[PDB]
Curated annotation (Swiss-Prot), chain C:
One of the record's GO cellular component terms: nucleosome
Protein name: Histone H4
Effect annotated for changing residue 19 to P: In TEBIVANED3; results in early developmental defects when expressed in zebrafish embryos
Modified residues (N6-(beta-hydroxybutyryl)lysine): 13, 59, 73
Cross-link (Glycyl lysine isopeptide (Lys-Gly) (interchain with G-Cter in ubiquitin)): 73
Positions bearing N6-propionyllysine: 13, 26, 59, 61, 73
Free-text description of this protein's post-translational modifications in UniProt: Acetylated as part of spermatogenesis progression prior to histone-to-protamine exchange.
Entry-annotated residues carrying N6-succinyllysine: 13, 59, 61, 73
Record organism: Homo sapiens
Modified sites of kind N6-glutaryllysine: 13, 41, 59, 61, 73
Residues of the full protein shown: 20 to 103 of 103
Keyword flag GTP-binding: no
Family: Belongs to the histone H4 family.
Covalent cross-link Glycyl lysine isopeptide (Lys-Gly) (interchain with G-Cter in SUMO2), where: 2, 13, 41, 61, 73
Main location: nucleus
UniProtKB/Swiss-Prot annotation, chain D:
Induction and repression of expression: Both the unedited and the RNA edited versions are induced by butyrate (at protein level). Only RNA edited version is induced by DTT, vinblastine or TNF (at protein level).
Organism: Homo sapiens (Human)
Protein name (Swiss-Prot/TrEMBL): Histone H1.0
Compartments reported by the entry: Nucleus; Chromosome
Lineage, opening ranks: Eukaryota, Metazoa, Chordata, Craniata, Vertebrata
Major location (coarse): nucleus
Section of the entire sequence shown: 25 to 100 of 194
Glycosyltransferase found in the keyword field: no
Gene that specifies this protein: H1-0
GO molecular function, a single term: chromatin DNA binding
Domain spans labelled H15: 1-73
Swiss-Prot record, chain E:
Subcellular location: Nucleus; Chromosome
Organism: Homo sapiens
Modified residues (N6-succinyllysine): 3, 89
Gene Ontology MF terms in the entry: DNA binding; protein heterodimerization activity; structural constituent of chromatin
Region annotated Disordered, chain positions: 1-15
One Gene Ontology CC term in the entry: extracellular exosome
Cross-linked residues, Glycyl lysine isopeptide (Lys-Gly) (interchain with G-Cter in ubiquitin): 7, 9, 113
Keyword Acetylation: yes
Biased composition (Basic residues): 1-12
Keywords tagged on the record: Acetylation, Chromosome, Citrullination, DNA-binding, Hydroxylation, Isopeptide bond, Methylation, Nucleosome core, Nucleus, Phosphoprotein, Ubl conjugation
N6-crotonyllysine: residues carrying this PTM: 30, 112-113
Lineage of origin: Eukaryota, Metazoa, Chordata, Craniata, Vertebrata
UniProt keyword Ubl conjugation, yes or no: yes
Protein name as catalogued: Histone H2A type 1-B/E
Curated annotation (Swiss-Prot), chain G:
Residues of the full protein shown: 24 to 103 of 103
One Gene Ontology biological process: protein localization to CENP-A containing chromatin
UniProt cross-link Glycyl lysine isopeptide (Lys-Gly) (interchain with G-Cter in UFM1), position: 9
Purpose: Core component of nucleosome. Nucleosomes wrap and compact DNA into chromatin, limiting DNA accessibility to the cellular machineries which require DNA as a template. Histones thereby play a central role in transcription regulation, DNA repair, DNA replication and chromosomal stability. DNA accessibility is regulated via a complex set of post-translational modifications of histones, also called histone code, and nucleosome remodeling.
Organism taxonomic ancestry: Eukaryota, Metazoa, Chordata, Craniata, Vertebrata
GO molecular function, one term: DNA binding
Effect listed in the UniProt record for changing residue 69 to E: In TEBIVANED2; results in severe early developmental defects when expressed in zebrafish embryos
Domain of life of the native organism: Eukaryota
Residues that bear N6-lactoyllysine: 9, 55, 69
Crosslink (Glycyl lysine isopeptide (Lys-Gly) (interchain with G-Cter in SUMO2)) position: 9, 37, 57, 69
Record's keyword terms, sorted: Acetylation, Chromosomal rearrangement, Chromosome, Citrullination, Disease variant, DNA-binding, Hydroxylation, Intellectual disability, Isopeptide bond, Methylation, Nucleosome core, Nucleus, Phosphoprotein, Ubl conjugation
Changes after translation: Acetylated as part of spermatogenesis progression prior to histone-to-protamine exchange.
Protein name: Histone H4
Length: 107, 99, 84, 76, 114, 99, 80
C-alpha cells in the first residue's frame, strides 16, 4: 500500500487534493489525473516562492524565512507579482521605493 | 487532560519538505508558514474554480487533468505557467506508469 | 456592557503621517489628515459590515478572523496570513 | 394513508391463499383501504421489486418478472 | 376512488412569481453550488431575479417612453442603469453592448458662458 | 427536412412577462432582450456562488433560502438589498402558505 | 501585416470624444494603439485558450465573453 504522491514523485498530498476537489463542489466527477496535476502545480509554485523568499532571507543574514522575505521575493519578481496582484501579505511591508523627483539634486 | 484540540489541517509539513529540497539550511517563521498556507489555499480555489467553469462551459461532468491544465494556462503568467504545465505533466506521466 | 466613544480621532496625525511615509510621500497638506480618516472610516465600515454579516449568518456573537478574511476577499482585498 | 411496504404486509398476512401470493389478488385487497391513486399499481410493483431483493419477502416460483411470493425468507 | 386526487400546479404560481422557480431550482442542483438545495432557496432566488429585472424594465421602459419609442433598446437599458445610483453600483464592472455613455462634459472644458 | 438548432434556454419569456406587468404597451429589441438575459444569468451566478461559499464556509451541505438571503445582503447595495430581501421573504412566505 | 495602423487617427479621436476629451496630443494616437493592442492580446489569448480546450478551430462569441469575464470586463448582450 503506497501513497499516490510517491507514485507521482511528489511531496504535496495527491490524496488530500483529490478529496478537496470532490468535496469543494467544483464538479460531480473528478478525474484521477486532476489531483496529481493540481498537487504538482501547487508544489511547483510553493517551491518557486520558497527559493526566492529563502534567498532574500539569506540576504538578510537570517536563517528563517519571515513574511518580509516572502513579500520581497514576490514583489521583486515580475510574474509572482502579477499572480499575487491583489494579495496582501500580512507583516510584509513594501519595497523600498522613493519617487525620483522627491530626492534632492545629487551633485 | 480536558479535551484535546480539534484537528486543523494545513499544508505546513509539505511546505517544510519542499523548503528543505530548495534551501536545506533555511527554515521558516510561524507567520510565514501561515502565509504559505493562504497562498496554497488561494491557488487551489483559483485553479479548481477555473477548471470547474471549463468543465461546465463544455457540458462536462468531470474535471480531468485537462481542465486543471487549461486552467493553469489561463491563470499563470508565462514562465510560471510553463514550468507548472511541465511539472504537472511530468507527475501524471510518472503516476500513470507506476499504476 | 458599554457603548463606545468618538475614537476615529485616535487615528492620529503622527500615524497618518507614518503611513504616508511608507507610501513614499515627502510633503503633506494640512487637509490630508482629516480626509484620510474619512477614507479609513469608510473602508472599515465596508469590511466590518461584510464580516459581521458572515458572523450573523453563522449565528455567532463573536467576529472571527475568518469573517474578516472572507469579507476582505469579497471586497477584492485578499489577505494572506490569517487563515483560509 | 400508510406506506406501500405497510400495504404489501396487510394482504398476504390477513388471509393467505391464492397462488401462495400473486399480483392480482394483492391489488384487489389493497385498493379497499389504501384509497387508490393512479400510481397505486406502479409503486406496488416497485415495492415488490426491492422487497424481493432485500430479504423481507422471498419468492416461491417464477421466471423474470412473473411468479409468486411469501413473507418468511427461505430457511428463516 | 374516494378522493385521492391528482392535481398539477406550478411552483412559481404558488410563490406568486413569473420567474421559473423550477428552472432555478434545477440550475442550483446542477450548477456545482452545493450537494443539496433547499426547498425555499429557488423561490427566494427567483423572487430576487424578478425584482431586479422588473426594476430595470420599469426604468428602461420609461426611458423608451421619453424617447417616443415602444421598444426598449440597449441605450434605454444603459440609461436606466447609469442614472440610478444603486443599479449603477451593482453593474459597475459590466459593459452593456451597444449602450453608449451618459452625456458628460467636464466643466473646465466648456467655454466661459455668454 | 431541417431541424438542427440545439435548443438553448433563455429567461426571455419571463423578461417579457415581467415586462407586460410594468409597462404592458412597450416591447423590447432582440439585443436588449439578450442584455437582460446576461443580466439575470450574471446575478444568478453571483448570488449562487456566495451562497455556495456561505455554506461551504459554515460546513453545510445545503444552500437554503437563508443563504440566498445572506448572499443578497452581501451582493446588492442598500436599498435594492432591502427590497430584494423583502420580495424574497414575501415570495417564500406565500409559497409555504400555498403548498 | 501591420493592421494596427487600421486603428486610424479619426477612429481614435472619436472614441476619446465619447470619453469627454477635448484636445489630444499627437503622441497619443500611437500610445492608444499600444494599449489597445495589449488589451486585445490578453482577451484573445484567453478566448482562444477556451477555443483550444473545446477542441475547435473557430472562435465563438462565448469564448470571447468567457475571457472578458475572467479579465473582469464582463460583457452583456452576447450570451452571458
Ligand atoms: Ca537551491
Ligand atoms: Ca390516467
Ligand atoms: Ca448532487
Amino acid at each position: 500500500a503506497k501513497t499516490r504522491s510517491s507514485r507521482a514523485g511528489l511531496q504535496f498530498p495527491v490524496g488530500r487534493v483529490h478529496r478537496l476537489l470532490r468535496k469543494g463542489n467544483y464538479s460531480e466527477r473528478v478525474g484521477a489525473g486532476a489531483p496529481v496535476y493540481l498537487a504538482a502545480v501547487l508544489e511547483y509554485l510553493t517551491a518557486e516562492i520558497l527559493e526566492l523568499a529563502g534567498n532574500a532571507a539569506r540576504d538578510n543574514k537570517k536563517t528563517r524565512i519571515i513574511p518580509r522575505h516572502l513579500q520581497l521575493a514576490i514583489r521583486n519578481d515580475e510574474e509572482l507579482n502579477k499572480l499575487l496582484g491583489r494579495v496582501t501579505i500580512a507583516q510584509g511591508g513594501v519595497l523600498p521605493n522613493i519617487q525620483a523627483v522627491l530626492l534632492p539634486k545629487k551633485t | 487532560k480536558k479535551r484535546k484540540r480539534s484537528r486543523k489541517e494545513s499544508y505546513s509539513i509539505y511546505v517544510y519538505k519542499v523548503l528543505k529540497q530548495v534551501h536545506p539550511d533555511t527554515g521558516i517563521s510561524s507567520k510565514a508558514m501561515g502565509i504559505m498556507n493562504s497562498f496554497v489555499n488561494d491557488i487551489f480555489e483559483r485553479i479548481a474554480g477555473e477548471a470547474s467553469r471549463l468543465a461546465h462551459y463544455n457540458k462536462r461532468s468531470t474535471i480531468t487533468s485537462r481542465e486543471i491544465q487549461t486552467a493553469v494556462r489561463l491563470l499563470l503568467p508565462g514562465e510560471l505557467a510553463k514550468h507548472a504545465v511541465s511539472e504537472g505533466t511530468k507527475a501524471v506521466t510518472k503516476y500513470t506508469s507506476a499504476k | 456592557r458599554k457603548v463606545l466613544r468618538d475614537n476615529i480621532q485616535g487615528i492620529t496625525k503622527p500615524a497618518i503621517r507614518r503611513l504616508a511615509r511608507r507610501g513614499g510621500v515627502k510633503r503633506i497638506s494640512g487637509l490630508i489628515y482629516e480626509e484620510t480618516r474619512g477614507v479609513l472610516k469608510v473602508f472599515l465600515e465596508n469590511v466590518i459590515r461584510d464580516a459581521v454579516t458572515y458572523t450573523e449568518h453563522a449565528k455567532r456573537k463573536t467576529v472571527t478572523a475568518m469573517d474578516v478574511v472572507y469579507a476582505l476577499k469579497r471586497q477584492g482585498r485578499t489577505l494572506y496570513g490569517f487563515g483560509g | 394513508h400508510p406506506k406501500y411496504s405497510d400495504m404489501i404486509v396487510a394482504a398476504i398476512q390477513a388471509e393467505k391463499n391464492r397462488a401462495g401470493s400473486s399480483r392480482q389478488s394483492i391489488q384487489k385487497y389493497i385498493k379497499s383501504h389504501y384509497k387508490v391513486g393512479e400510481n397505486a399499481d406502479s409503486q406496488i410493483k416497485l415495492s415488490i421489486k426491492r422487497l424481493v431483493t432485500t430479504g423481507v419477502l422471498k419468492q416461491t416460483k417464477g421466471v423474470g418478472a412473473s411468479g409468486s411470493f411469501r413473507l418468511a425468507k427461505s430457511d428463516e
